[PDB]
Amino acid sequence: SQYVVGELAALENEQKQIDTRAALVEKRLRYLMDTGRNTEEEEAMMQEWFMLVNKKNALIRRMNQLSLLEKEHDLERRYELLNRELRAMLAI
């Protein structure tokens, strides 16, 4: 529980910064691609676009790994949760 949410919270925050910068790189890179106004800023934005894509991909992979672990915990909570039902059934 403890390790997971700490890490998910941090990643989810970093994902918010990525998506925020990327919306702006996109707006801009699209404007340059459509107008042809500056093939050099264009290429530099493309690079940045792709760096941002790389970051997001690495976060998504880290998130999914953590989510697996969180599912395995949850299942274990449910295992222990069933043990409680057995106990309470014996408290007569």
Place this chain on the structure above:
Amino acid sequence: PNASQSLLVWCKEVTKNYRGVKITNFTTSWRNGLSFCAILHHFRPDLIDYKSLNPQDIKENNKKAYDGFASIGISRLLEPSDMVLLAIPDKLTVMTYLYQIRAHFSGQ
């Protein structure tokens, strides 16, 4: 070579000698679905029968590739209907999509 050039070179290496594929750009070269399907076939030939594909079946070729890629973890950035009525495919979407396919197979 810059990021576009290197991506384009990768696309041509991977699809080399696939019948009906001719890559010269990130727009009209992708419309008919073959190029995408050839990329899929090259990595995962168990997921698609390339020899039976029909070059004129724009919707179906694109669908097979998008479904093949989605089935191994690559998010859909294109729908088959984005190719309909002779639309030129959006350059930045096609590039990002190919970028994600290459990144998937490079262990990202």
